[PDB]
Design an enzyme around this catalytic site. Structure first.
Site, PDB file in Angstrom:
ATOM      1  N   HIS A  44       0.801  -1.223   0.000  1.00  0.00           N
ATOM      2  CA  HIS A  44       0.000   0.000   0.000  1.00  0.00           C
ATOM      3  C   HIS A  44       0.829   1.266   0.000  1.00  0.00           C
ATOM      4  O   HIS A  44       0.302   2.320  -0.371  1.00  0.00           O
ATOM      5  CB  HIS A  44      -1.063   0.021   1.119  1.00  0.00           C
ATOM      6  CG  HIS A  44      -0.621   0.493   2.468  1.00  0.00           C
ATOM      7  ND1 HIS A  44      -0.392  -0.401   3.498  1.00  0.00           N
ATOM      8  CD2 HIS A  44      -0.504   1.752   2.951  1.00  0.00           C
ATOM      9  CE1 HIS A  44      -0.092   0.338   4.553  1.00  0.00           C
ATOM     10  NE2 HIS A  44      -0.133   1.640   4.268  1.00  0.00           N
ATOM     11  N   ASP A  93      -0.455  -7.171   2.018  1.00  0.00           N
ATOM     12  CA  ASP A  93       0.262  -5.908   2.131  1.00  0.00           C
ATOM     13  C   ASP A  93       1.763  -6.220   2.399  1.00  0.00           C
ATOM     14  O   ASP A  93       2.267  -6.116   3.514  1.00  0.00           O
ATOM     15  CB  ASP A  93      -0.338  -5.063   3.256  1.00  0.00           C
ATOM     16  CG  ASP A  93      -0.274  -3.571   3.054  1.00  0.00           C
ATOM     17  OD1 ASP A  93       0.244  -3.132   2.023  1.00  0.00           O
ATOM     18  OD2 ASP A  93      -0.742  -2.847   3.920  1.00  0.00           O
ATOM     19  N   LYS A 160     -12.643 -10.374  16.601  1.00  0.00           N
ATOM     20  CA  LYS A 160     -13.778  -9.863  17.377  1.00  0.00           C
ATOM     21  C   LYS A 160     -13.849  -8.340  17.291  1.00  0.00           C
ATOM     22  O   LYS A 160     -14.934  -7.762  17.205  1.00  0.00           O
ATOM     23  CB  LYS A 160     -13.677 -10.295  18.849  1.00  0.00           C
ATOM     24  CG  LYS A 160     -13.870 -11.795  19.106  1.00  0.00           C
ATOM     25  CD  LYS A 160     -13.941 -12.100  20.621  1.00  0.00           C
ATOM     26  CE  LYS A 160     -13.678 -13.554  20.953  1.00  0.00           C
ATOM     27  NZ  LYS A 160     -12.317 -13.772  21.539  1.00  0.00           N
ATOM     28  N   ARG A 161     -12.700  -7.684  17.324  1.00  0.00           N
ATOM     29  CA  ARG A 161     -12.632  -6.230  17.219  1.00  0.00           C
ATOM     30  C   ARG A 161     -12.865  -5.754  15.793  1.00  0.00           C
ATOM     31  O   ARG A 161     -13.230  -4.592  15.596  1.00  0.00           O
ATOM     32  CB  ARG A 161     -11.271  -5.722  17.714  1.00  0.00           C
ATOM     33  CG  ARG A 161     -10.803  -6.371  19.010  1.00  0.00           C
ATOM     34  CD  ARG A 161     -11.762  -6.125  20.153  1.00  0.00           C
ATOM     35  NE  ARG A 161     -11.287  -6.745  21.390  1.00  0.00           N
ATOM     36  CZ  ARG A 161     -12.051  -7.000  22.445  1.00  0.00           C
ATOM     37  NH1 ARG A 161     -13.345  -6.695  22.426  1.00  0.00           N
ATOM     38  NH2 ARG A 161     -11.531  -7.562  23.527  1.00  0.00           N
ATOM     39  N   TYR A 162     -12.608  -6.620  14.785  1.00  0.00           N
ATOM     40  CA  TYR A 162     -12.796  -6.250  13.395  1.00  0.00           C
ATOM     41  C   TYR A 162     -13.852  -7.128  12.760  1.00  0.00           C
ATOM     42  O   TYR A 162     -13.548  -7.943  11.876  1.00  0.00           O
ATOM     43  CB  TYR A 162     -11.473  -6.254  12.607  1.00  0.00           C
ATOM     44  CG  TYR A 162     -10.496  -5.211  13.113  1.00  0.00           C
ATOM     45  CD1 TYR A 162     -10.645  -3.875  12.790  1.00  0.00           C
ATOM     46  CD2 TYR A 162      -9.452  -5.559  13.955  1.00  0.00           C
ATOM     47  CE1 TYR A 162      -9.763  -2.914  13.269  1.00  0.00           C
ATOM     48  CE2 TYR A 162      -8.570  -4.605  14.446  1.00  0.00           C
ATOM     49  CZ  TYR A 162      -8.736  -3.282  14.114  1.00  0.00           C
ATOM     50  OH  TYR A 162      -7.840  -2.347  14.580  1.00  0.00           O
ATOM     51  N   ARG A 163     -15.107  -6.964  13.230  1.00  0.00           N
ATOM     52  CA  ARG A 163     -16.272  -7.688  12.724  1.00  0.00           C
ATOM     53  C   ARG A 163     -16.527  -7.391  11.242  1.00  0.00           C
ATOM     54  O   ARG A 163     -17.047  -8.243  10.537  1.00  0.00           O
ATOM     55  CB  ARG A 163     -17.524  -7.323  13.538  1.00  0.00           C
ATOM     56  CG  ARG A 163     -17.722  -8.139  14.797  1.00  0.00           C
ATOM     57  CD  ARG A 163     -18.858  -7.561  15.619  1.00  0.00           C
ATOM     58  NE  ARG A 163     -20.092  -8.342  15.507  1.00  0.00           N
ATOM     59  CZ  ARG A 163     -21.148  -7.980  14.780  1.00  0.00           C
ATOM     60  NH1 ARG A 163     -21.129  -6.847  14.080  1.00  0.00           N
ATOM     61  NH2 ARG A 163     -22.232  -8.751  14.742  1.00  0.00           N
ATOM     62  N   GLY A 186       2.728   6.667   8.459  1.00  0.00           N
ATOM     63  CA  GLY A 186       4.165   6.839   8.337  1.00  0.00           C
ATOM     64  C   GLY A 186       4.955   5.666   8.866  1.00  0.00           C
ATOM     65  O   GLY A 186       6.146   5.565   8.596  1.00  0.00           O
ATOM     66  N   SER A 188       3.754   2.375   8.392  1.00  0.00           N
ATOM     67  CA  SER A 188       3.497   1.225   7.531  1.00  0.00           C
ATOM     68  C   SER A 188       4.731   0.846   6.746  1.00  0.00           C
ATOM     69  O   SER A 188       5.559   1.705   6.467  1.00  0.00           O
ATOM     70  CB  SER A 188       2.375   1.530   6.556  1.00  0.00           C
ATOM     71  OG  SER A 188       1.141   1.713   7.218  1.00  0.00           O
ATOM     72  N   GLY A 189       4.850  -0.427   6.423  1.00  0.00           N
ATOM     73  CA  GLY A 189       6.016  -0.932   5.728  1.00  0.00           C
ATOM     74  C   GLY A 189       7.112  -1.385   6.665  1.00  0.00           C
ATOM     75  O   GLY A 189       7.899  -2.265   6.319  1.00  0.00           O
TER      76      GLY A 189
HETATM   77  O1  LIG Z   1       0.040   3.860   5.522  1.00  0.00           O
HETATM   78  C1  LIG Z   1       0.951   4.710   6.007  1.00  0.00           C
HETATM   79  O2  LIG Z   1       1.533   4.510   7.062  1.00  0.00           O
HETATM   80  C2  LIG Z   1       1.269   5.948   5.210  1.00  0.00           C
HETATM   81  C3  LIG Z   1       0.629   5.918   3.821  1.00  0.00           C
HETATM   82  C4  LIG Z   1       1.363   5.548   2.689  1.00  0.00           C
HETATM   83  C5  LIG Z   1       0.735   5.533   1.443  1.00  0.00           C
HETATM   84  C6  LIG Z   1      -0.623   5.871   1.346  1.00  0.00           C
HETATM   85  C7  LIG Z   1      -1.359   6.233   2.478  1.00  0.00           C
HETATM   86  C8  LIG Z   1      -0.723   6.269   3.727  1.00  0.00           C
HETATM   87  O3  LIG Z   1      -1.400   6.606   4.910  1.00  0.00           O
HETATM   88  C9  LIG Z   1      -2.675   6.033   5.200  1.00  0.00           C
HETATM   89  C10 LIG Z   1      -2.862   6.110   6.717  1.00  0.00           C
HETATM   90  C11 LIG Z   1      -3.542   7.187   7.301  1.00  0.00           C
HETATM   91  C12 LIG Z   1      -3.742   7.224   8.683  1.00  0.00           C
HETATM   92  C13 LIG Z   1      -3.282   6.185   9.497  1.00  0.00           C
HETATM   93  C14 LIG Z   1      -2.605   5.102   8.922  1.00  0.00           C
HETATM   94  C15 LIG Z   1      -2.125   3.961   9.746  1.00  0.00           C
HETATM   95  C16 LIG Z   1      -0.947   3.299   9.393  1.00  0.00           C
HETATM   96  C17 LIG Z   1      -0.518   2.185  10.126  1.00  0.00           C
HETATM   97  C18 LIG Z   1      -1.266   1.704  11.202  1.00  0.00           C
HETATM   98  C19 LIG Z   1      -2.459   2.348  11.536  1.00  0.00           C
HETATM   99  C20 LIG Z   1      -2.895   3.460  10.803  1.00  0.00           C
HETATM  100  C21 LIG Z   1      -3.284   1.861  12.720  1.00  0.00           C
HETATM  101  N1  LIG Z   1      -2.406   1.176  13.685  1.00  0.00           N
HETATM  102  C22 LIG Z   1      -1.695   0.025  13.101  1.00  0.00           C
HETATM  103  C23 LIG Z   1      -0.741   0.502  11.990  1.00  0.00           C
HETATM  104  C24 LIG Z   1      -2.406   5.067   7.532  1.00  0.00           C
END
Ligand SMILES: O=C(O)Cc1ccccc1OCc1cccc(-c2ccc3c(c2)CNCC3)c1
Length: 236
Positions: A44, A93, A160-163, A186, A188-189
């Site tokens: 993503h 992902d 359970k939290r993600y029905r 920020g 993610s990945g």
């Molecule tokens: O996906 C990214 O990190 C940054 C990114 C890259 C490319 C496109 C969109 C984008 O942002 C979307 C976005 C917006 C708000 C929060 C989240 C978010 C991210 C990770 C986790 C959670 C939420 C909840 N906790 C578990 C882990 C993601």
């Protein structure tokens, strides 16, 4: 990272900051060094990325302020997204960045192992999520690399939290029942690295979740052990 503290140099050497350079240069996503020219990140992150031309992988970075116009980085030769990937919330992902040159391993940049063949039944009790992401939903990208110890929760508990979502065995969740510590935009990945018998393993990849660090809403991660065959097929 919500509810985390600052890391020191060489604490999470497999952690990388993937930057984009279009329309502006900034921290896009996180990643993990899993080989001399391999980064394991989330698919993503490349939504709206037209080609690997605009990407930069920075390794051995503690603060984002260290990144100057002369800071060394790795070019990306190829972005390998999982063939089944569609949306983050639905799984797959996982992506692989093949760098343009090899990484010379030092204390600030080394590779993280994947979960071992034979460690499927391991109960991970020392897991950490790291990154430069937001500290709350409407925040900004951080300067120092945050860290947070998060307990893993079962697939049944997480479902359970993600029905309204399909929590599959290719996903792993991590969260505190009363919220507080989690990964946000920020992060993610990046890795969810669990230490077992004093060896770090890349257990999950930061993926998604309802809000950031809300109560009874665990973070959803890509279950790396499930994709080890895909990773080995690609990195050979
Ligand atoms: O996906 C990214 O990190 C940054 C990114 C890259 C490319 C496109 C969109 C984008 O942002 C979307 C976005 C917006 C708000 C929060 C989240 C978010 C991210 C990770 C986790 C959670 C939420 C909840 N906790 C578990 C882990 C993601």
């Amino acid at each position: 990272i919500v509810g985390g503290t600052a890391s020191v140099r060489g604490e999470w050497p497999w952690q990388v900051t993937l930057h984009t350079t279009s329309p502006t240069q900034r921290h896009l996503c996180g990643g993990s060094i899993i080989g001399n020219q391999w980064i394991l990140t989330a698919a993503h992150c490349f939504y709206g990325v037209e080609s690997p031309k605009i990407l930069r992988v920075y390794s051995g970075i503690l603060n984002q302020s260290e990144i100057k116009e002369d800071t060394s980085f790795f070019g990306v030769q190829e972005i390998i997204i999982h063939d089944q990937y569609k949306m983050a919330e639905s799984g797959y992902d996982i992506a692989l960045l093949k760098l343009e040159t090899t990484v010379n391993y030092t204390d600030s940049q080394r590779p993280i192992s994947l979960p071992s063949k034979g460690d499927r039944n391991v109960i991970y009790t020392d897991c950490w999520v790291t990154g430069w992401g937001y500290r709350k939903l409407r925040d900004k990208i951080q300067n120092t690399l945050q860290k947070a110890k998060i307990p893993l929760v079962t697939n049944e508990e997480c479902q359970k939290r993600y029905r309204g979502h399909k929590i599959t065995h290719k996903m792993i969740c991590a969260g505190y029942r009363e919220g507080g510590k989690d990964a946000c935009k920020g992060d993610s990945g990046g890795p969810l690295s669990c230490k077992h018998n004093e060896v770090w393993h890349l257990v999950g990849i930061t993926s998604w979740g309802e809000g950031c660090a809300q109560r009874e809403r665990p973070g959803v991660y890509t279950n790396v052990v499930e994709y080890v065959d895909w990773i080995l097929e690609k990195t050979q």
